[PDB]
Structure formats: structure tokens, C-alpha cells
Amino acid sequence: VTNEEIKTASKIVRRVSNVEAFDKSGSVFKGYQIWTDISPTIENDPNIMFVKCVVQQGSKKEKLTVVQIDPPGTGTPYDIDPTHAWNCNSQVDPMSFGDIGLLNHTNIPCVLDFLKHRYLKNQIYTTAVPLIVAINPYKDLGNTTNEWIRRYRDTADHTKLPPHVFTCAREALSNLHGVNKSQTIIVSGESGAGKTEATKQIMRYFASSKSGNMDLRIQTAIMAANPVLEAFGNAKTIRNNNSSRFGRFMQLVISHEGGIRYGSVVAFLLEKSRIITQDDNERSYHIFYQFLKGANSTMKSKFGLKGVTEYKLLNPNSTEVSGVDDVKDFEEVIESLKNMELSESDIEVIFSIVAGILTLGNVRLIEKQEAGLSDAAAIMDEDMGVFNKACELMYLDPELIKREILIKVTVAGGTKIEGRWNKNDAEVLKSSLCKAMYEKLFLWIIRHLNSRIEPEGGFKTFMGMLDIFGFEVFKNNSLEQLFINITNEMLQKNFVDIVFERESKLYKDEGISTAELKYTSNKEVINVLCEKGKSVLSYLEDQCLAPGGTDEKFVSSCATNLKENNKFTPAKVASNKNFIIQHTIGPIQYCAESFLLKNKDVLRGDLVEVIKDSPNPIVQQLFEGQVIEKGKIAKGSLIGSQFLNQLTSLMNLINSTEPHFIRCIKPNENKKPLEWCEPKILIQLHALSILEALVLRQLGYSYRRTFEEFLYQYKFAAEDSSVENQNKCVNILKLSGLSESMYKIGKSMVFLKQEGAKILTK
């Protein structure tokens, strides 16, 4: 636990309702429990934020006398200001029901406890309508097996099943075949929160068919994609041994009995930087390690493969991951590529290109005295065999690749002015080639799979499945985080809209005015980030296309022009290269250092044309359909421009569907089962809008009983005397002296505000 985590969590903490510890006679109710912010136990443990106390008999109303009961205390009473006392759900078994909304008090210490109780008892799934909250147990609980799938698929009454990832899978599928409306399951959270697993389990649910009377050629290709996608797009980070370094979107056609008929995969924003360099105790993509360890002596000889520690692009110190068998994973990947309908030759080409990327990374560049220059780059003389092997393996012409990396042509005036690149600029070009070849090989493998698994006329009604990171808030947030946080702003509008849509329908069905239902939009912050001409992304594109473009000038243009909006804020410390966006979850600071370097990181020009001129059909296809444009930078070769189009395309699809949300929590930073870090978890409850989903549910007339249920709560039908029961309630609410704003009477139910429902019990 960092001190930044403690500072951040403390800002999330809020007290709303008032603690009612005293009886009508001013005496403390017998063993009345409260949560408190104050305790030595809290100060001494960074994992503890709140403590449970019993308010002592004879306590004063303005200063509470409490004895801390859990964590076990000294027994010594202490005085607290009632502003530091939150209500407690004493007498509630968190194991008996799966919805947080069912609790009487849903404050921060109450929500943390409900989920903690359940987590420690190995109940990791909890509902906070419309959300499914899943907490990483860091162990197999055996609750995602085939018998558990059958249990969730075949059970007649869905209300008899506890919360599970499978509840979204069952609900989404039921609504799809029920009303012929497309559905989307959005799986988000931090890295190591278990999004990967949630997606893998939902897909296995969907693959399980009641009657095996359907062709499974496509389904086997889709299911075989996960080991391949993981091998190429996932990597070991300090936070996760299998971190997904890309955003995944899938469209599926599922039979009502189960079984995947058709599918389409979309990968976006792969971490290109990782192919070239890795931090310490971090690896590059799994495939490099799987291939170098798992490939047979025949392929090892054919591709001239060295060991995992003999490559410049792979960290030598971090080549081993405990619990990860790269050799067995390689067997699984190869088998999966075969199940994706790729021939032994197609596979041999894929691994030739992989070995070629690794080989090219081992080619050393130096700075020679040539063409009247002292800084002309050149390939090291003993590495000329290595460079040729790299080109042979990638099915490229070494002479044309060499010319592209070393020679610099300025085509100004129609006139070709031929120069040379320096060792630094040529190392940039050699590195861009490894990154582009890898990304486009990964994208090709996906394009191949899609040609085999996609429906003929495209999708009409489909099951959408997005896997992305949630809101990212690090010390240093860069371009990558800005993209994830923009994506999350889009999905925030989807969340808010469906919550409102579902509530508004209910009120309309009962004949209650939705005029009081009032929830704000995030149109403003979306605009400050995306809006054509008037946005952060626009000024980024503008500064990338400007010849004298710098990170500082991009921040300055934003500061100047987006001064109009309250959503853009310059940073207090290092104003020149730092900014703040007022996201819905709060202010998120970004560091604009290397924004242009990262936004411009796309292989372009005559290098792309050398790849397209390859005699190999797979290599030809990698850059198939490219802007060409050697000289110089088009918005067709800028990352943010590409991203915003892809995002608009993605959102247009998601916006056409019914959304389902799975919010994944990482409970500790030590990959340990049954360990609970309250600050870490609080930040995530906030960021994943789990706390907002509770605030929203409880807004307006949230207390809804029927006419009869309201009459039973008063001790003294429906189909014989509904207008009698309707009027019996209207008289009760006039007699109790409640304000007309506190209640509304509908076709069959009584609509009470949360505060008005409380006044009725007292």
C-alpha cells in the first residue's frame, strides 16, 4: 500500500445518513453498532480504513462513547464525533443474499464489509444492479466447471441461482433470443483483477450446448483463439503473470440451446513498446518465450534459434515465470493454430516471421565515415550475416530493407535529394520494423481467424463482448491511459443510459412522472477529449502534423483553447508538460511527455512497400490496405486518429445493444488468496462506478411495495379490490402527514422516496 493510495482512498470516504443510536427515551439502544474512521488499529494498519464499535450505555448524543469490538480492541472506551460514525448492518448474514442494494445501509464501510465477509468465505460474486462485482480469489474455487455451467444454463428459476459471471451470460442470452435485440457483456477492471478469466469462462458457458446437434468447426476455431491471442497479446508484468496488453472486442452468434455458430474478433491498442524493451521483473509477449523454449531441434536449426537469454529484445534476467510452463503452452498454441485452419506451412511462416523479428533485434548498428559525413549509420560487418538471416526469415529483400534503414531520401521539389540516417535515427527505423511486423502478424492471425469464423451477410443480432481496462489512475498517466480513460467515458454514458432507461420504463408502466428522475450526462468531458477541432485529441493531431511540433506546444494549445471548459485543468506542478481532465470519477492528471513520439509511432513510407513486395502471400497481406504516403505524416498514420475512428466504430455497435457489466476487483497486490487491502479495494469500488450504481438505484421513489404489501406492513384484494387497496394507501399517506413530494401512487404499487419510507417506520 502506497501513501498515494491512502491519500486517494481518504478522498473517496464520505458520510451521508445519520446514526440513530438513541431510543425515544434518549438512552443508547442495547449493543448498538457503528463503523468508525478513528482507531489506533487503523493508524497502525495501512490495509484497515474502518473499525466496528459498540456505542456504550449512557453515551452523550453530541460525542459518542464507543468500544471497538472488531478488529479486537483493548476494551477501553473512547469518544468520537458522530460525524466519524457510519451506520452498521448488525444482524445481517452477507452469505444469505447476493445484492448489496438489499442492505438497509449501503455506506462505504458497510459495502466494504459485505463484500469482505463474502470474499473471505470464497463468495467472490455480488450484485449491485445492474453490475456483477467479481473479486480475484487468486485460486481455483471450482465454481466455473462444466457442472456449474449446466447448473446455470438448465435451471428453470434464475432467482434461485447466486450471483456469478454466468448470471450475465444467462441474462444476456435470454434477452437476445427473447426479444431479438443484440446484447453486450463489458468486462472491465485493473490489471490482475481477473478480466481474462471472466471472459474465458463466459465464452465456455456460451460454447456449452444442450443438444450437440450443430456443426462445431467455427466454435473450435473461436475457442482455440484464446491460447493464440494470449501468446501474442499478453505478457508477464509485475502486477500480472498473464496481463492482456490489448483491448478485445468480439461479436458472437450463439444458439438458444448454446453453442457458438459465428464470431468476429477485434484487437485494439496493442503495447508495441514491449516488443523492443521490458522493465525489470517483466517479460515481452509469451510467444517469444514459448517458441524459444518449446520449438523442436528441427525448427531451432531451420530458423537458427538461440536461447531465451541470447536476444537483445527479450529481458535475460526475467525469462522464467514461476508456475508457467512455456513449452506446454507452446504445444497448446500450435494445436490452436491448427484448429484455426492454418496449414503446417502457414504455421512455419508465422514462426519464421517471429524468429526474423528476434534476429533483426540482434543486428547491431554503428556510425561510419561515409558520403562526406562522420555520422552515417551502417550495419556492423559481423552482423551482416545476422541481418540477411532476419530478412530471409521475414521473406524480405535485405538490399531494400538495408537502403530504407540507412539511406534518407528528401523528395522536395520533385527532385530526389539522397542523404544518410544517423545511428540513432536508423535504430528507430530498425525498431519500428520489428514492432510493425509483430503487430501486423498478430493482426493478420486475427484477420485469418475472422475469414473462417465470420457470418456471410455480417451480423444482425449478435452477442458483444468487450474486455478493456477500467479507469487508469497512476502517478504518471501517459497516452495509453488517455485512450483507456476516453474509452471508459464512452461506456459510462452506456451505463448511465441503461440504468435510466430501465427505471424510466418502470415509472411509465406504473404511470409515475419521470420528471424527478434526473441524472447528468458526461457530454462535456467526452467533448473536451474527442470533439472535432475543439478537443485534446484534435490539438494532439494538430501538433503531430505541425513540422515544429512539441509536447509543450500541444499542452499550451490545450490550455489556451480549452480554457472555456471546466473539464480541462492545467497542472499546478510542471504546468508546461502536465494537464488534468475532470473525468466523471474525478480529476485524472496526465503527463504529456512523449505524446508526439507515441502518437507518431507507425511504420510508414517505402519500408511498407518493401514488405508488400515480398514473394510470400502472408507477408504481402500484413500491410495490405495502407495509405502509402511516404512523404510525410498523414492522419492515416497517427495512433490517436486511428483509435478515435476504431472507437467510434466500436461505440456505434455497443450503443445499438443492451449492456451487461462485469466489474473486476484485485483485493491485494501480492497475488495472494484471502488478503484484503481496504484502500486498494475502495479506489476500485469508486473507479468501477460500483458506489454510483448504489447512489442511482436509491434515487427518487426507490422504495416500492405493492398496494397489498403496503397494507400488510400496516397489518390490514389486488384482483378483487385494487382501487380499494389503492385508496386505502392514499388515505394512510395523508393520515401519516407525509409531504406530497415523498410519495406517488401507481397502477399497482406505492412509490416512496428513501427518506419518506423511513419517516413511515418511525
Author numbering: 3 to 718, 723 to 768
Paper text:
Four molecules are present in the asymmetric unit of crystal type 1, one of the motor domain is in the Rigor-like state and three molecules adopt the Post-rigor (PR) state. Second, the interaction between the Relay and the SH1-helix is mainly hydrophobic both in the PPS state and in the Rigor-like state, with the exception of an electrostatic bond between the RelayQ494 and the fulcrum SH2-SH1S691 that is present in the two states. Third, the PfMyoA Rigor-like state is stabilized by atypical interactions of WedgeI587 with Switch-2F473, Switch-2V475, SH2-helixH688 and SH2-SH1S691 (red circle in Fig. 4b). Additional interactions with the N-term extension further stabilize the Rigor-like state, including a strong salt bridge-π interaction between the N-term.extensionGlu6, Switch-1Arg241 and Switch-2Phe476. The electrostatic bond between SEP19 and ConverterK764 stabilizes the Rigor-like conformation while it is unlikely to form in high ADP affinity states. The PfMyoA Rigor-like structure reveals how an interaction of the phosphorylated serine in the N-term extension with the converter is directly involved in the last step of the lever arm swing associated with ADP release. We conclude from the structures that the electrostatic interactions with the N-term extension compensate for the absence of a piston-like movement of the SH1-helix, enabling force production by accelerating the transitions of the powerstroke.
